[PDB]
Each structure stands twice: as structure tokens, then as C-alpha cells.
């Protein structure tokens with residue numbers, strides 16, 4: 001039970017807190033479905049405090065405290081908790097002013113960012129130097145270390161890969177309490193393990209993130225379909241390799257069920273009421289139970305000719321497509337306004353009291369060969385007759401842009417779809433129904449032989465995690481767990497080794 005000097009110094013300096021206010025704040029997450037109180041919350045003022053805690057953990061025999069690294073707690077099912085353990089309040093690393101926690105490189109080819117930093121601040125500090133990361137998440141108020149522990153995907157991933165494919169190097173403190181810098185060339189085994197590694201191997205204190213010259217504006221389009229075959233064929237055309245890709249900077253898509261079509265179209269924040277009326281009419285003419293929309297952008301800069309060159313490039317692209325004649329809808333915004341588009345959605349929902357609610361989200365990767373089966377079984381099947389609150393996002397990814405040596409698990413096929421069904425619960429009895437429906441969707445997929453992977457989900461059975469990674473890739477994961485977290489204390493809320 002004796003404490004090392006450096007661990008005791010943290011309690012003395014008021015950094016180790018055991019009060020009910022501190023512990024309660026670190027006991028809930030964005031999922032708002034599960035909770036777990038820690039014994040203590042650490043508020044580090046430097047990476048030395050992290051070394052202190054993890055060295056103590058490693059050297060103290062019989063050490064009982066699991067350790068989690070809370071980013072912004074956007075986890076869905078407790079992945080950032082440490083039940084009866086220590087939660088690290090990562091945000092405390094950026095409390096001061098000296099030194100800065102985000103540094104754009106002198107050559108403008110990368111940005112250095114603290115693990116604790118949120119992507120919105122990474123964006124703001126990048127644009128101040130005329131650059132920006134190439135690969136995003138839909139939502140910018142997430143931490144660098146958090147998204148990198150998962151993958152980080154948005155409409156750019158088809159061409160640039162996920163955020164984990166856009167890291168040059170990291171500083172990481174392992175379960176041993178050892179500060180290690182890692183890359184493809186230095187300590188590559190740790191580098192690959194941590195990326196998509198679900199916080200199992202250590203804490204990312206710094207990430208070196210690839211940037212590109214920052215575009216000024218995004219030409220922003222949505223294309224409407226009643227035929228899934230045409231919708232998916234076009235998403236695949238837009239994202240297909242020609243190493244080289246087509247013009248589009250971003251390609252996502254969405255599914256709208258007929259029952260709430262007008263309301264959901266109106267709630268996109270994209271369509272006007274005039275647009276909505278035309279799409280509702282189209283659905284009725286085609287007798288459609290589902291409507292599909294491709295969402296795409298073309299990034300361009302402040303050049304004088306840029307706007308007309310964009311018009312012509314866009315016109316050419318669209319002429320290769322098969323959306324319903326006349327159902328192309330365009331917007332034109334500043335690039336930062338596009339990237340932070342979901343912030344506005346959060347503000348609106350929270351003011352309605354619809355943000356801090358349970359989020360039984362279903363996120364998965366579905367092989368291209370079975371996407372039409374998934375559409376029939378889920379969008380045209382299971383989901384029909386239900387009231388859906390939250391977007392249903394569907395878009396293809398290219399496996400060639402994913403590094404399978406990293407921890408992140410993906411389907412085997414060259415093309416696979418991100419399917420994100422972002423259900424928001426309107427309290428009882430809606431939550432239990434939504435949890436059951438997600439089970440049924442997974443059940444449908446299992447029975448149809450669809451070889452999907454989950455994303456952002458934590459499994460509670462060993463056989464499920466083994467299947468998740470694949471047996472050979474699982475053994476790799478375990479090898480790296482043994483070297484970097486032998487005491488199995490880190491990120492216990494993933495329920496892999498805890």
C-alpha cells in the first residue's frame with residue numbers, strides 16, 4: 001500500500017482527486033447508456049504526471065487500479081471509463097499557455113498536436129498557417145488521441161484513408177511508464193498497435209498529422225435517387241481509383257425512409273422547402289419506400305478562375321452519373337464552415353434537449369458484394385414502419401487506403417461501406433426498442449452470411465473480439481498487449497482484456 005514519491009506528489013498538488021464531483025464527471029459518456037465511477041481522476045499538467053502514474057502502476061506489486069484516458073468522452077458504451085480505477089482527464093494537458101499544444105511544422109507539411117487536443121482546435125491552428133489535415137471525422141469536437149485509437153472516418157477516407165493512415169509519428173507512454181516516440185521507421189510495432197488500438201497499449205501524448213494546403217471553399221452537392229442500385233453504382237464510380245482518383249474531395253451518402261421523408265429532408269439543413277416538396281413528389285411517383293442521397297464536395301481555393309473551373313468540373317462529373325434528372329442540389333460555403341457543419345447540429349439538438357440523450361448508434365463496415373442485400377434487409381426491411389431520429393449514413397471505402405498491419409479491423413473486400421445508423425433515443429420505451437433493433441440488424445447480417453466488422457462498438461465476449469480482428473490478427477493484438485500493457489490496466493472499458 002505504500003506510494004512512490006512522484007505519485008504522492010500528485011495528490012499533494014491537488015492533481016489526484018477523489019471527490020464526488022471529479023469522479024461523477026468521469027463516470028458518464030456520450031452514449032448515455034452505461035456508467036461507471038472511478039476511484040480517482042487525475043488532472044495532469046504535464047506528460048511527467050502521466051509517467052508518474054504509469055511508472056507507479058508498473059512498479060507497485062498488486063496495483064489494483066485500471067487506467068483510462070478520457071478525451072472528450074464521446075464513447076458510446078463506456079470505453080473511456082475506469083470502474084474503481086483512475087480516469088485521466090486528458091484535457092488538463094492543454095490548461096496553460098506555455099508551451100503551445102499544437103505546432104504546425106516550419107515546412108508546412110505536418111501539424112504536431114497533443115493527444116488531448118480536439119480536432120476543431122487542430123483545424124483552427126492549421127488554417128492560421130494556411131494548411132489543414134486531409135482526413136477528417138464528421139464531427140470536430142473529438143480528441144486527436146481518441147479518433148486515432150479507433151480510426152477516424154469521413155467523406156475523404158476513400159481517397160486519403162482514415163485518420164490512422166495520415167499519421168507520421170507519435171509520442172506514446174506505455175503501460176510500463178516509458179515515454180516512446182514511434183513511427184514506421186522507429187518502434188513501428190508500437191506505432192501500428194496504437195493506431196486503431198482502442199487505448200490498450202498506452203497513451204498518445206503527441207501525434208504528427210499530415211496536412212495539405214488549405215482550400216478556401218467547398219462546392220457542396222446532394223444528388224437524389226429512388227433506385228439503390230443506381231445510388232451505390234454512382235458512389236462507387238465517384239470513389240473508384242482511375243493511386244489516382246476522380247475530382248470529388250468528399251463522398252458520403254444518406255438513406256431516407258419514406259415514413260418521415262419530408263421531416264428528415266427538412267432536418268438535413270441542406271434542402272429548402274421547395275427542394276423537399278420536389279423529392280417527396282418524386283418518391284410518390286416512383287412508389288419508393290426509401291430515397292437515397294449522395295453528398296459530395298469539390299474543394300477549391302480563392303483563385304479568380306476557381307468558381308468557373310469548378311462549375312465545369314462539376315458539370316462533367318455529374319454527366320457521368322445516373323441520379324434522377326434534375327435532382328442535383330448545390331451549395332457553396334467556406335471550407336471551415338463545411339468541416340464544422342455538425343457543430344451547428346449539436347447546438348440545435350442540445351437546445352431542444354435532444355443531444356444529451358441515449359445514443360444506441362449502430363456503426364459497421366459492410367462488404368460491397370452484400371450492400372444491396374443490406375439495403376433490402378435493413379433500409380427496405382427492418383427499418384420500415386419505425387420513426388427514425390438521427391441520420392442514416394452510407395458510403396463506400398477503398399481498402400487499399402487502409403493499413404491492415406494496424407490494429408483497426410476491416411472487411412476483406414477491396415470496397416466496403418461505412419454504414420452509420422445514428423439512432424437517438426426519445427427516452428423510454430424508445431431506448432430498449434432501439435437496442436433490440438440493433439441486435440436484429442446484426443442477427444439479419446449473421447444469418448445472411450454478411451462478413452461485416454463493427455466500428456466504435458465494444459464486444460463483451462472474447463469470441464466476438466477474436467472474430468472482430470480475425471484469429472491471426474487477434475494473436476498479433478495480444479502479443480502487443482503483452483509487451484506494452486502486461487498488467488492489463490489500460491482502457492478496461494473496451495472489455496477486451498478486462
Ligand SMILES: *Cc1cc2c(cc1C)nc1c(=O)[nH]c(=O)nc-1n2C[C@H](O)[C@H](O)[C@H](O)COP(=O)(O)OP(=O)(O)OC[C@H]1O[C@@H](n2cnc3c(N)ncnc32)[C@H](O)[C@@H]1O
Nearest residue numbers: 069071072073074075115138139143145146152153199204
Ligand atoms: C460523439 C461523436 C463521436 C463521433 C462522431 C460524432 C459524434 C457526435 N463522428 C465520427 C466520425 O465522423 N468518424 C469517426 O470515425 N468517429 C466519429 N465519432 C466517434 C469517435 O471517434 C469516438 O467517440 C472516439 O472515442 C473519440 O472520442 P474521444 O476523443 O472523446 O475519446 P474517448 O471517448 O474519451 O475515448 C475513446 C477511447 O480511446 C482511449 N483514448 C482516449 N484518448 C487517448 C489517448 N490520448 N491515447 C491513447 N488512448 C486514448 C480511451 O481510453 C478510450 O478507450
Ligand SMILES: *[C@@H]1O[C@H](CO)[C@@H](O[C@@H]2O[C@H](CO)[C@@H](O)[C@H](O)[C@H]2NC(C)=O)[C@H](O)[C@H]1NC(C)=O
Nearest residue numbers: 098099100101102103112113114115205206207
Ligand atoms: C510545441 O512547440 C513548443 C516550442 O515552441 C514545444 O515546447 C518545448 O518542448 C518541451 C515541452 O515539454 C520542452 O522540452 C521545451 O522546454 C519546450 N519549449 C518551450 C519553453 O516552450 C512543445 O512541446 C510543442 N508541443 C507539441 C505537442 O508539439
Ligand SMILES: *[C@@H]1O[C@H](CO)[C@@H](O[C@@H]2O[C@H](CO)[C@@H](O)[C@H](O)[C@H]2NC(C)=O)[C@H](O)[C@H]1NC(C)=O
Nearest residue numbers: 257258259260261262283284286287288289290
Ligand atoms: C410514404 O409515407 C406516407 C406517410 O407519410 C404514405 O402516405 C400515406 O398513405 C396512407 C395510406 O393510403 C394514407 O392514409 C395517408 O394519408 C398518407 N399519409 C400522408 C400524410 O401522406 C405513403 O403511402 C408512403 N409510401 C409508400 C410507398 O410506402
Ligand SMILES: COc1cccc(Nc2ncnc3[nH]cnc23)c1
Nearest residue numbers: 138139153342345363391418420422
Ligand atoms: C463513423 O461514421 C460516423 C460515426 C459517428 C458519427 C458520424 N457522423 C455524425 N455524427 C453525428 N451527427 C452527424 N451529422 C452528420 N454526420 C454526423 C459518422
Ligand SMILES: *[C@@H]1O[C@H](CO)[C@@H](O)[C@H](O)[C@H]1NC(C)=O
Nearest residue numbers: 028029032033034035356357
Ligand atoms: C444520461 O443522461 C441523463 C440526463 O442528462 C442523466 O441523468 C443520466 O445519469 C445519464 N445516464 C447515464 C447512464 O450516463
Ligand SMILES: *[C@@H]1O[C@H](CO)[C@@H](O)[C@H](O)[C@H]1NC(C)=O
Nearest residue numbers: 127214215216217301302335
Ligand atoms: C479567401 O479569400 C477571401 C477574400 O480575400 C477571404 O475572405 C477568405 O478569408 C479567404 N479564405 C481562406 C482564409 O481560406
Ligand SMILES: *[C@@H]1O[C@H](CO)[C@@H](O)[C@H](O)[C@H]1NC(C)=O
Nearest residue numbers: 284285286287288289290380
Ligand atoms: C407500391 O409499393 C408498395 C410497397 O413496395 C407495394 O406493395 C405496391 O404494390 C406498390 N404499388 C404499385 C402499384 O406498384
